[PDB]
């Protein structure tokens, strides 16, 4: 299984920087965003678990001036479970 | 001025390749051991390496002259050899095994996810492997130039990485590396452990 | 692949006024206004980038009069990822 | 020949939690342990250098609120002798 | 006179690395589609170069004009623009698709376990990846020569090797790719069917 | 250390010719904005270069690591780009506008009507249009070196003078101009008021 | 008669660090590695007089940054009873 | 085997300029008279020179050996001189004046208005002055290599153009020139009425 | 297709000094025995070359993948080596010792008293030790290519000459001497008895 | 600021021969004189040199400028000639004779019976005459750069050497020479009597 | 040709305990000794350089304790010409 990749800022615009420096910084496949609601967003990305950890580390490091960053996760071996029951980009 | 006096027990393949592919002498093959000497002035190693060739079986690759950094290294599979010629260069010199400048590291940095145009300009101003757009990479800067081969040797025998560049001469020693993005950190891991545990005058 | 503006305000109000004087800054191209929930509501605009750079800077200065700014940002060139998960406007 | 992961816990119990831990964390491939008396037992893993480097840490992070963990070491390439001669799983 | 007219539908990473690597026009990037024409006398390809940068986007990074033969390239995102680019080019020169020499293959081998004392030779005398002591070597020669990059895309992608060298240009097209036994043996059956599957003039 | 920030808003053919004739990345062409940027020390710019290409289109062409003078061109059409890549570059690393050193002019000769044997060794150690016997000769060094592609481009804009050379790394920047009189008198004061114009630490 | 190398590491995973470094510094054989129990194994590597010294000084270096080394020690030329009477490797 | 033997009353100074800046020689000057021998086999030239060098005070420039072809150039202000060394090359080789190949032109192409992809191309592999784009451009190739500098002489005596690059030994002796519209026309029709008047062997 | 199959028994120190000062591999010291393959097409070289590293322990110096053309140089100490290594390259391409092509001279000339004027170009154009003004030249052409390398090796071994340069790669193998008179006389006769007593097709 | 001004009023054959053989300019014959001006800084002598091309007949080979290290070589039969050359260029300048650095000698090193593995990086980094394995070895160093040709001249003007690699620019004058050992010794004597009976301010 | 170590030693019984203590330090090989009279008699050993140089240092420090030692002296790479008309065990 593809490995997990998420960033939660309160802010639209800090959520939009950290899935763009995601992706500018790893071979990473943004899935998608949830919106938990009062102003919490979180970016997803998704892929090997070097390119993902890069990615957050790189995430983490944009978002932090644009907004308030509120938690930076890899998960590097998800179980099905989680991809089955949460729209994680691997629903299948 | 004994500057560099770096002995490298055993040549990981890509390290022995790219010494092979921009050697001014004889060209070593893997598995061989290796011996770089860097001192100042520079024209004083034109006698320092024949001392050496006339003492034992080593046979050298690189030797650069600038009146300011001499370079050497010597090649040969017997490691005995190549230490007594290192006893030889050391006594032609009048100095010692710990008058060698420890090294410090200048500038370490990894630039994860290369774009492609940055490849362009790494890859046509190098000579080892190609560095991939998307891969990682890793530089780094040592004092003095010559241990830049030995982070190079140590970062090849720990990681899976790519050798891009190494430069032994100069002011400042720069180091190359390309691959995936946990064995650029093994092998950043590598030379910055394999650096600053070399004994030295500060 | 334009460049990408976000004003993010507390306040609809705000944001109206920063999407406001966006638009009339510069040659920039309102595509919407994303509502994450709590009171964060954030316009975008998108266009080329010294549009946009004096757009949102048009849109930070007037929008700290009447409301809670809480994020401003250019992104010069989204990376085609973002432009195709995230709703900013170039969906293909 | 794919990276290898060993975790040495002076009781089987950690070891036991700390291999669960492994396993469940990334894509590795628990080949045995070893047994060198006096308590010392050590789990072996072995895998990609991605997978290993957050396997042994989610090991070691899950095996200290058990156990007693005495070493954590990751070798990103073992060299083909160490394969031959010492039982690590790779025995030609 | 059309010699080559073949089209790289997409560029395999390390082939549009080393392309990049050894351009004299503007450098492409991977996932870009190509196309190259080698046509005699050897000038008369600055004529046919203008025809595709007066209709299409295209944009060229080899345009060689050897001591016999004459090399394009094009390449450019959107594949209708390079096919576009191609009909303007056989318009152009007013000859059909298949038009082109038809490709022979005069030496293809596949060399087991290359000494240490062969791999600094080769790898000092190209400008690719270098090939490491212990990998098996693939060597080709095709004629034209611009069939060169058709065999190296296709190893590439059909395989996971190294390109150590090709060269698209000269007498005879060469390519030298190194890598482990079953992947060399894969790119080598991708390779020699790929230029079989080219049709043209005898 | 900023040393150099400077922003050419529009390459002149000759100017963007000659970069293009000695790119070792990628290379523009005319009518394109570039910015040039020239920092102390020099390896910092890997990065640095690495930020710019991540936001925004701009594309390298001339990325020189010396350890004490790091060079880097970028060029796009829209100017916004390449403004929005020089202020990514000041904000990696994070200087200023006013933190570039203002340039000096060391030497300005104009040589009326060089012989033919200085035009052998003018031409033979230069890249750009040849120089003919008869014709005069502006020689320009400013410091720092990265500001003597400003002067070309404005001496380009102004007169109808053939750029010989133009050498923006090292210490000096070094500008070789040859034409007729009137025109090398109107490219030298071009040249000498484009270069004090320039705001910056003394 | 072929120089012995023998490196004495409390721990297993030590031990293979040291082995990893020892195989790879110079040209030696592993033979082996004997358990003596208490968790103290030993690595014994088997060359000539110029490989093993190399090769020990490596396994000393980074031996130490995984746990303890309880022992060192290059011996040039063994006794032939020393390789008959004990399991170093040449027992004929 | 006397392949071409041209005679240069009047060398063009771009020409004198662009032949003094990639000569293996002595360097000559714009207004010398030129004498331009190239035979087959290459190393027998070597004889050649030393016979117009045990007669006259003329002087070499280009002694290129080539893969097949060797070319001799030898100059001097005196066209006497000149006319006696060639009078001792033709007694040495035992031919006449007629006995030379007669040259074939390939291809003869005018290319209006290039594009400035293909003008950072053309003059990115050349060695004399830049192209710029929108300037029209000749290219032209003749068989023997040798003649290809009169196609470069007269089509500087009858115009005002800027000579690019001519490579005058080879298989396939080539030109380059750029310059505006109607002014490459007038060099191009005395650059054709120039090489199909002389006359020799077919 | 085998081109040139010549082999040296010991290498003058000019001449390996000449080899291992513009080689790509492994650099020959004076008196080692050698060995020069010249096959075409070029690039089955790469095979042929490997064949003598599976059979014997030669150190290769020059392989030179030419145009059309490919060219091996192997060197040893011991003949017992070097003639292994022949024996292996012969039977690999399964040919004879005569399958070879006999070589041509398509020009030979000895150039007296050159003077300046041709000694700068000729030793700009060169890669040897400088011609000097004086001094007597000898140039040389062999067809197949290798050959011109035992056209140098016998033209110092019976003669004290400067090697200006040799060419062993390409269409005409080329030889550039130097040296006094009756040296470059006794060089020139060397030469040509050694080029004409070489059987092939 | 003057370095060196030295009169060779000889060159005689193997240093005539190697500047011939590296010189981006005119070249020299054996039998004239020269004049080896090294001036600081650098980018003056552009018009320096042509000072001297207005004034006499002299014809230049060497002209280097490093903005640290300007130097000039001109060389002409008639000894007047140069010695004119001369007055006109410290003239220019407005020095004298003796405001020239007098040399002195920083490293002679005799190094006899070189091995060949030593030959190969010596003769591999150098122009002139190969050296041979069992030859003597002569390395100096000269302060300033350019008295490295004089020394060369009078060595080889004196004894039967061979020489190897002169190097009159960059920080300190560089000089090889080979031969047997009776031989070196008188060129060594010759070449340490040659320096130090120059007068100059220290 | 291999490496050459000699101890001098004026009196027999100095040189035979450094003969003894260097073919016990490594592998070497004792192949004779000189009589050159009045006393002075020179043992050798030969083997390769690593052996050889930690042989003859034993041998001196064995030798220091019994005898006037004269001369310590190790030659790496002997030339074929000393080899072969001195008497110093490797005559063709």
Same mark, same amino acid.
């Given at each position: 299984?593809?490995?997990?990749? $998420?960033?939660?800022?309160?802010?639209?615009?800090? $959520?939009?920087?950290?899935?763009?420096? $995601?992706? &500018?910084?790893? &071979?990473?496949?943004?899935?998608?965003?949830? &919106?938990?609601?009062?102003?919490?967003?979180?970016?997803?990305?998704?892929?090997?678990?070097?390119?993902? &950890?890069?990615?957050?580390?790189?995430?983490?490091?944009?978002?932090?001036?644009?907004?308030?960053?509120?938690?930076?996760?890899?998960?590097?071996?998800?179980?099905?479970?989680?991809?089955?029951?949460?729209?994680?980009?691997?629903?299948? | 001025?004994?500057?560099?006096?770096?002995?490298?027990?055993?040549?990981? @393949?890509?390290?022995?390749?790219?010494?092979?592919?921009?050697?001014?002498?004889?060209?070593?093959?893997?598995?061989?051991?290796?011996?770089?000497?860097?001192?100042?002035?520079?024209?004083?190693?034109?006698?320092? %390496? =024949?001392?050496?060739?006339?003492?034992?079986?080593?046979?050298?690759?690189?030797?650069?002259?600038?009146?300011?950094?001499?370079?050497?290294?010597?090649?040969?599979? =017997?490691?005995?050899?190549?230490?007594?010629?290192?006893?030889?260069?050391?006594?032609?010199?009048?100095?010692?095994?710990?008058?060698?400048?420890? @090294?410090?590291?200048? %500038?370490?940095?990894?630039?994860?996810?290369?774009?492609?145009?940055?490849?362009?300009?790494?890859?046509?101003?190098?000579?080892?492997?190609?560095?991939?757009?998307?891969?990682?990479?890793?530089?780094?800067? %040592?004092?003095?130039?010559?241990?830049?081969?030995?982070?190079?040797?140590?970062?090849?025998?720990?990681?899976?990485?790519?050798?891009?560049?190494?430069? @032994?001469?100069?002011?400042?020693?720069?180091?190359?590396?390309?691959?995936?993005?946990?064995?650029? =950190?093994?092998?950043?891991?590598?030379?910055?452990?394999?650096?600053?545990?070399?004994?030295?005058?500060?």
């Amino acid at each position: 299984a593809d490995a997990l990749g $998420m960033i939660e800022v309160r802010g639209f615009v800090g $959520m939009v920087e950290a899935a763009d420096a $995601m992706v &500018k910084a790893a &071979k990473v496949e943004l899935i998608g965003y949830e &919106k938990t609601g009062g102003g919490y967003v979180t970016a997803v990305v998704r892929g090997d678990v070097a390119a993902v &950890k890069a990615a957050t580390e790189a995430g983490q490091r944009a978002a932090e001036r644009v907004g308030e960053v509120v938690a930076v996760h890899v998960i590097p071996r998800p179980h099905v479970n989680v991809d089955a029951a949460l729209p994680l980009g691997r629903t299948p | 001025t004994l500057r560099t006096y770096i002995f490298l027990d055993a040549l990981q @393949p890509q390290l022995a390749t790219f010494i092979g592919k921009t050697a001014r002498g004889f060209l070593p093959v893997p598995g061989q051991a290796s011996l770089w000497v860097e001192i100042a002035p520079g024209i004083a190693i034109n006698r320092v %390496t =024949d001392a050496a060739l006339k003492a034992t079986k080593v046979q050298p690759a690189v030797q650069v002259v600038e009146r300011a950094y001499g370079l050497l290294e010597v090649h040969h599979f =017997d490691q005995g050899e190549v230490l007594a010629a290192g006893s030889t260069i050391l006594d032609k010199l009048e100095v010692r095994e710990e008058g060698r400048l420890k @090294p410090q590291v200048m %500038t370490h940095q990894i630039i994860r996810a290369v774009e492609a145009y940055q490849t362009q300009i790494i890859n046509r101003n190098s000579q080892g492997m190609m560095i991939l757009p998307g891969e990682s990479l890793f530089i780094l800067e %040592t004092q003095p130039a010559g241990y830049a081969v030995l982070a190079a040797n140590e970062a090849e025998k720990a990681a899976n990485v790519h050798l891009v560049n190494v430069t @032994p001469y100069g002011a400042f020693g720069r180091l190359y590396l390309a691959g995936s993005e946990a064995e650029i =950190d093994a092998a950043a891991e590598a030379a910055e452990a394999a650096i600053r545990s070399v004994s030295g005058v500060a």
